[PDB]
């Protein structure tokens, strides 16, 4: 386990080879999850990019968080998609927490600790446990077929994942930096492999 | 019996079918009232929607608070309508209180604790006590004929109603959240029943 | 005498008949005066209205503070006018103070405690003491012939008047609502008569 | 000598006859100087005006601070001139300090305690002390040839002048109203001759 | 050497002759650096200018920080350039810190203590120690061939340089004016040569 606390991955070039792959010894399929992360990039006015990409052998977009140019955050689970529109994008590091629940299909999207409206997606689905998690790229297969025009450029960090929906009060503790214990994927204890041109640096965000 | 403190109803998809019916003990006709409720929806740019629909067997729009696209809050009692202009709208949860008084016809409308100018409406009218209070839908008959295009999407909560006009000091306490106790419809002691795609979830607003 | 503290007059309808008449104990003519008041109205985008009309047998516009559509605050003394043009207006309660001094003709106009530039009006004039003071209407006879399109809609209150020019420091404490004592017209010791649709209600402002 | 503290001159109408003449005790030519003042006017919407004027038998614009419409502050020494352009202006009192040094020609212009870029002007020149200082008018002969379209309207005060360049730290104590002691022209011990319709009134700026 | 603290160099007119040379005590080639500085100029809307020019006998733009009109900051190493574009610019002093690392090519740019996204430049390059460092001008030969169009006008100071990439925390204390000690170029201990119309004055920025 590597403690990545206060560190961030830097993807400083547009490329299809640069990525990191994050391990998840997860034994059971996800009836719900939350994923939170920090990212920073100036691509938001140039083009879309993959922020977080979870894939399984049956489904290359099993969870994906994706900025889509001139729209906002695409959030898609099980290959079906919703949009959270962002009409005035800004150049700053941004903290997103997203969460999804099978029992109701409710999606929550939180940006910088402010909630977006709850939306419905994939009620009754179940996210596969045998999955490849990739940062820095969008993957179109179980572990590859990355597209250079979908790569992230800039920084990502504080990637945390839970197998349950965090309440609003928990998400405030995340954003404000209280203590917490992610039970699927944990930045304090991350297991990962780095590929290509990717660096670990001090985080820019406070 | 249910105490909904810190919980909100979620209507996560547009339909003609998802709604909740709220029950009131009142049998004395309302010579005045206040209703306060907190809600969050992104429909405000796309289309109109019904925030709070109060029908009586005589009259489908006995009280209604409604958002009209590019107009602002429509408010109506006894089927007669006034408009509160909202020249620009922002995506965030919004708390409104509205109160009406037959003896003067004055309507007050309050948005996030800031008052709109008082207006006259239906002086001398009297709202019927036999009531079908419905959230999430607009009703065009007593408890039915919902127009799906008028449905709410998103969250509603803290629905409280009083048989009298709250003073400005009380209304500030409602918004900032101090102690109070309504006598027509109390969120902390809410008789309700639920139909269709409706969920009770932790409230997104502090 | 009525202490109108915390209370305001509400004019909830257009009419040529809703008004209040304020009685001044005023024997000697005014070589100088100050008037301060709160009002709140949505007419500002739509048409002009009379904030404060002071009339005499010789002159129906002996003092008049008047909003002029797409122009701003007209202030007239003795029927001569100057304009404090406002480039754009916002819907919130407004506090104004106006002072005038015959011995110099200098007018000061204050809005929310911010001074507008001093101007000259009717140097050496003398305002009559035997006056009809009307709130809610503009008058063109001594006490009547109101014009409906000039009537106020919404609220007025904290109407105070002094037979001398307040300094900048006093006018600040008027806006802050500190200790002061008017001597021509006092909201805590008001003598008035109400005609038509007018109501006394809690004030909508701090 | 008169202590004008807390007081300001008021020019309440446009004319070419109202002005006030300030007497400097100075006898030795100025190789450097600073002047600071508060003024307030609405004319910036409409026309240029002479804020501070200094003239000599040989030169009518020996120092002149002048608002040039659609441009900003003109500053001129010895009849040559530079602009500190101002793209956005607002109706409020404004405090300016300007300072000049023959040994470099560097001008500093400070507006509301926030500095403008240093610009060179009349390097090596020398300013005549046998001078008439005028507020309210531009000045085209030693004491006269005023131009009505260049008169100031509104208020002027805190006129202070030093025969040396104040440091940046000193100028902050001016703007924040701390202690200082001018030696060419001192608002706390002023000599002046008021002429025409000019009034001394309590200042509007804090 | 001189302690220049609280003082800045003023370049008050455009020329191809006014410049200062800073004598780095530098002997071993730089595999990384940080340079921080304050500058203030109104040229940013009119034309580009050289903020900090480092050259070696082989290479006239060995490190160059430059403003490109309607583009933003150009940062170049070894003659290769990246843009940190700026869509809106304001007339105020600006503090920049910039860093580069040979081992990765990661460039950081910090404007007023806000980080720009990290970008890749000149991986594996090395920066020569035998160098001419010049402010006020761009240099196209080792110590000369200045272009008037590329001269700085206005003020520059607090120039500090390190032979290593400062962390985000260390860069914050620089912006906040906490204690630090540069090891390549130090404003507390500057060695420099001055040519032409350049002056040392008290700094305008806080
Ligand atoms: C989310 N998205 C559809 C915009 C892009 C990803 O889809 P795909 O390229 O992986 O097929
Ligand atoms: C308020 N409204 C008139 C815009 C919509 C509701 O009217 P209705 O559809 O119930 O007849
Ligand atoms: C509108 N006005 C204040 C300029 C003039 C009003 O004159 P009048 O309508 O009272 O006769
Ligand atoms: C143009 N100016 C306003 C800076 C100077 C005017 O000098 P003058 O010709 O009006 O006396
Ligand atoms: C402006 N620039 C920094 C991109 C290039 C400058 O080239 P040069 O003028 O130093 O030769
Ligand atoms: Ca894919
Ligand atoms: Ca893809
Ligand atoms: Ca209806
Ligand atoms: Ca309907
Ligand atoms: Ca009249
Ligand atoms: Ca009239
Ligand atoms: Ca002149
Ligand atoms: Ca002239
Ligand atoms: Ca060069
Ligand atoms: Ca060059």
Author numbering:
A (entry chain F), B (entry chain J), C (entry chain I), D (entry chain H), E (entry chain G): 1 to 206
Study authors write:
C-reactive protein (CRP) is a pentameric protein of 115 kDa composed of five identical non-covalently associated pentraxin domains. The B-face binds to a range of ligands, with the canonical example being phosphocholine (PCh) head groups in lipids such as phosphatidylcholine. This is a calcium-dependent interaction, with each CRP monomer chelating two adjacent Ca2+ ions. The A-face modulates many effector functions of CRP, such as activation of the classical complement pathway, where binding of complement component C1q to CRP is mediated via predominantly electrostatic interactions between the Ca2+-containing globular head domain of C1q (gC1q) and the A-face of CRP.
Decameric CRP is formed from the offset stacking of two pentamers via their A-faces. Intermolecular contacts between monomers within CRP decamers were also dominated by non-covalent ionic bonds, which formed a second ionic zipper, perpendicular to that found in CRP pentamers. Ionic bonds included Asp163(chain A)–Arg188(J), Glu170(A)–Arg6(J), Arg188(E)–Asp163(F), Arg188(B)–Asp169(H) and Asn172(C)–Ser181(G). Although decamers appeared to adopt C2 symmetry, they were solved without symmetry applied and reached resolutions of 3.3 – 2.8 Å. In all maps of pentameric and decameric CRP, clear density was present for two Ca2+ ions, and in conditions including PCh density for the ligand was visible and adopted similar conformations between the cryoEM derived models and those found in crystal structures. In contrast, there was a slight increase in the prevalence of pentamers at pH 7.5 when in the presence of PCh. The addition of PCh amplified this difference, with pH 5 containing 93.3% decamers vs 40% at pH 7.5. No major differences were observed between the decamers at different pHs, with or without PCh, other than the proportions of decamers to pentamers.
